[PDB]
Design a protein around this ligand. Structure first.
Ligand SMILES: [Mg+2]
Length: 835
RNA sequence: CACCCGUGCAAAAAUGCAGGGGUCUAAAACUGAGCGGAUAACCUCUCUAU
RNA sequence: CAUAGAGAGGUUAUCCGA
């Protein structure tokens, strides 16, 4: 169940000096101060419209009782007594990595004797983590077409300086320029059309490649983003993301050109596309002015302002209109627009008059301790919503049902348009460089990744804004240092990101390149009259083909489709009803038997199977097989990439905390030579002649750098794993994770697997096979040899090897546990702890 | 069935009960979002064809 | 500038399994 304190209305508890402050939830992700306690002495802020009242206040915590919605009473622990019980004074808590003073001194001027700034700093760190992961994914997608260049690319040089490599007398950069030249002109550049292709007029319009300057600028921006996020830059370059206004003119121009296209393609046709909707709404909103109504419609549909009010308008409308038989065939043709107008009416009803009703609904939602209440309150609200808006819904339905009158209302243009355009999407000349760079980064990833990245950024920026508002209200110092003053405008950035969330979609395949992708689509199934044209047409339009090609070589995907255990596991993840539907679509008998038959059929898909009695039967069968194959391989590849993202997070965190600990005064040494120097430095052990001679002692655990390694058992376990690791193996693992070499070489690394129990096991088997292949002709330590022999003998990933080469993350115990023991890696598959 | 912290109780150096964690792990609450298919209208540029 | 028929893209629903 969820936290009862959060449901009671307690947002957070902040320790400032010897006093403590308790906040409350507000409109959206806002915070309101109402309670200050100084050693069992309570003073109430927010004298009017309170959120909760504290019953008993003690040094050990505070018991509170809420007033919003359900009167749920809970208890909250005192932050000033953290780490100070049964072992004897009040002190401001520190982060578990013992890096709070260093982070405060870095992002701000000095230490602040409170636990508010550190949360903002950790939100910034989360922003950097997610940016690192998705920039690494984008770089891998851009590099996959090769079937070095993207590592040394920096924005300090423009295309004019890069062009001097034509006559360069040194081969080191001549090879780089040759690689750049080979990059352009590649047919695989047809993907990512919005990043490399632009529309051109006939003197009809066709998509053509941009000039070399713009392509180089895009590549440089992406490469520098990856280099800055993944690595720990030193000097001015470490502020590259937060000083994007200092970029050269070429990069700004390419960012503006990339960003302006969707905006100019969305707000230009807004009036014409939704004409009938505004006409009907004006008919039913007789009193409201037309300009204000169209402004509200634009803010509701294009900007999608109905997805951040706290509740779900869609759920309320669904639970309201279900009673009346609008789901019947009678309104089948008009359902699409009628429902949209219903949600619009609901939205304008909750922002003009029923603001208090919306606040009550969101309060009841927040105070619920389970899922049963979250539906009962929705139904209760929907009853009143029906009883109030039945007439308006009926009027809209009858107006839309008049297809004759609908056509009569479509050919007449009387809308005021050149006035009140301030609601339109801001062009590239008004948005910040950070948002444009984020959009350019998103132009290289799949839609789910885009949604995850944008939502995470919006949430973190909202967190930063709320914390800044809290600090301003409390009177605390919040002036960032001169290098991070960008974050002072964070609120504005949040808006842009929210605005960016309105219209950002996946990338579009170029229309003219529909023939160049014929070979890739025809070869992803490994085929090689005119039936192959049908197969290519039915493969290209699949949404999973984009992911399968942008993130994998089609021939390699076809080769890895022969791994029967892997495909069998992916089919096992699919529920029984879906498997039955697939079998009935692909063929004219238990669930497991049908799953095995499907896994056998997909493994040797051939041209004979497609060719081989109605034309409306064999065509659907071939389509079903094609779509099933594409779905299976897409799921496998996507989950493998998502698993690799976690280790990308881990290595970025390792680099960042290495730099932070080195700044904090800990002798960590260089990290490029050995990636596990953080863990030894935190423990305090040294590589005496290449091995850790020191054994376990309780004193070493008692004097660890951070609270993570202050438990004797986990200290001993991680030290033992360290003594069983190898520097070269760790470096190769880091390179494989950062460059996604395991996923790229999936053809070979999956050849001789026996059984797959989860995606974690498959990914680590791939990595272990890659490590064995790279070290097949090199001298390795006895532990690595034992691990490789065990992997070869069992033909399954070795968990001890995972514990061995994941030791660089050992300084963070929770991350190490999550990334080593299977069953704790994925939150969607909660397993059992093996240790 | 993760990690850390608080409090009661058994102990004697750890078990249990009940909680908290934005300052632990992709990871605070409402919501936005991170799951997969199989059909539907409606708009735009046509492009022979009416 | 009506009906047949293609592509290619916008939003939007509703249906079952989680
Ligand atoms: Mg966090």
């Amino acid at each position: 169940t969820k936290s009862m304190a959060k449901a009671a209305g307690v947002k957070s508890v902040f320790a400032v000096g010897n006093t403590v402050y308790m906040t409350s939830f507000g409109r959206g992700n806002d915070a309101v101060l109402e309670q200050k306690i100084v050693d069992t002495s309570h003073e109430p802020l927010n004298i009017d419209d309170p959120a909760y009242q504290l019953n008993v206040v003690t040094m050990n915590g505070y018991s509170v009782t809420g007033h919003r919605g359900e009167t749920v009473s809970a208890v909250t622990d005192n932050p000033l007594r953290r780490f100070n019980g049964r072992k004897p004074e009040q002190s401001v808590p520190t982060d578990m990595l013992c890096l709070k003073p260093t982070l405060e001194k870095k992002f701000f001027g000095k230490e602040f004797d409170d636990n508010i700034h550190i949360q903002l700093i950790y939100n910034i760190l989360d922003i950097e983590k997610i940016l690192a992961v998705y920039s690494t994914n984008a770089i891998y997608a851009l590099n996959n077409m090769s079937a070095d260049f993207f590592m040394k690319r920096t924005t300090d040089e423009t295309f004019d300086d890069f062009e001097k490599k034509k006559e360069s007398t040194n081969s080191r950069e001549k090879a780089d320029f040759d690689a750049f030249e080979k990059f352009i002109g590649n047919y695989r550049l047809a993907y990512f059309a919005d990043a490399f292709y632009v529309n051109k007029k006939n003197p009809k319009a066709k998509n053509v490649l941009r000039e070399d300057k713009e392509l180089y600028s895009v590549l440089t921006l992406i490469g520098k983003l990856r280099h800055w996020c993944v690595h720990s830059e030193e000097g001015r370059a470490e502020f590259w993301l937060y000083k994007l206004d200092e970029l050269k003119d070429d990069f700004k121009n390419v960012l503006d050109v990339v960003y302006n296209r969707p905006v100019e393609e969305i707000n230009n046709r807004f009036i014409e596309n939704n004409k009938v909707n505004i006409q009907i709404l004006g008919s039913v909103y007789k009193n409201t002015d037309i300009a204000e109504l169209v402004r509200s419609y634009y803010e509701f549909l294009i900007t999608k302002k109905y997805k951040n009010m706290g509740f779900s308008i869609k759920k309320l409308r669904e639970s309201m209109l279900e009673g009346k038989g609008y789901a019947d065939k009678e309104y089948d043709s008009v359902r699409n627009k009628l429902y949209q107008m219903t949600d619009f009416i609901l939205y304008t009803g909750y922002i003009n008059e029923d603001s208090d009703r919306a606040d009550d609904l969101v309060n009841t939602l927040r105070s619920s301790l389970k899922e049963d209440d979250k539906t009962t309150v929705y139904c209760k609200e929907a009853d009143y919503l029906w009883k109030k808006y039945r007439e308006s819904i009926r009027e809209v339905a009858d107006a839309l049902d008049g297809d004759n009158i609908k056509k009569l209302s479509k050919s007449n243009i009387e809308i005021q348009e050149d006035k009140l355009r301030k609601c339109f999407i801001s062009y590239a000349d008004s948005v910040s460089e950070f948002t444009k760079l984020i959009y350019l980064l998103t132009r290289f990833l799949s839609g789910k990744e885009i949604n995850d990245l944008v939502t995470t950024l919006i949430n973190k920026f909202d967190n930063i804004r709320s914390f800044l508002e809290i600090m301003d209200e409390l009177g605390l110092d919040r002036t960032f240092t001169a290098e991070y003053s960008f974050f002072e405008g964070s609120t504005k950035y949040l808006a842009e990101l929210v605005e960016l969330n309105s219209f950002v979609k996946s990338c579009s395949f170029d229309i003219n390149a529909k023939r160049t992708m014929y070979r890739d689509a025809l070869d992803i199934l490994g085929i090689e009259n005119g039936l192959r044209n049908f197969i290519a047409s039915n493969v290209i339009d699949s949404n999973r083909f984009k992911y399968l090609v942008r993130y994998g070589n089609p021939k390699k995907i076809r080769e890895t489709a022969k791994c029967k255990p892997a495909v069998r596991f992916v089919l096992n993840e699919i529920p029984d009803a879906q498997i039955e539907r697939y079998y009935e679509a692909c063929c004219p008998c238990s669930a497991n038997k049908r799953r095995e038959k499907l896994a056998d059929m997909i493994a040797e898909i051939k041209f004979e199977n497609f060719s081989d009695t109605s034309e409306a039967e064999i065509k659907r069968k071939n389509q079903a097989i094609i779509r099933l194959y594409l779905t299976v391989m897409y799921i496998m590849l996507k989950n493998l990439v998502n698993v690799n993202a976690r280790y990308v997070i881990a290595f970025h965190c390792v680099e960042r905390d290495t730099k932070l600990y080195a700044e904090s005064g800990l002798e960590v040494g260089n990290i490029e030579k050995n990636k596990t120097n953080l863990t030894m430095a935190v423990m305090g052990v040294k590589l005496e002649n290449g091995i850790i001679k020191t054994e376990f002692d309780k004193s070493f655990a008692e004097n660890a750098a951070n609270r993570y390694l202050r438990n004797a058992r986990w200290y001993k376990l991680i030290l033992d794993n360290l003594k069983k690791s190898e520097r070269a193996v760790v470096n190769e693992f880091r390179n494989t994770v950062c460059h996604l070499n395991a996923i790229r070489n999936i053809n070979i690394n999956i050849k001789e697997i026996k059984e797959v129990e989860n995606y974690f096991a498959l990914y680590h088997y791939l990595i272990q096979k890659h490590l064995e292949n790279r070290f097949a002709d090199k001298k390795v330590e006895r532990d690595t040899g034992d691990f490789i022999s065990k992997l070869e003998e069992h033909k399954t990933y070795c968990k001890d090897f995972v514990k061995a080469y994941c030791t660089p993350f050992g300084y963070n115990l929770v991350r190490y546990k999550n990334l080593t023991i299977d069953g704790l890696f994925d939150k969607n598959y909660p397993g059992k702890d093996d240790s």
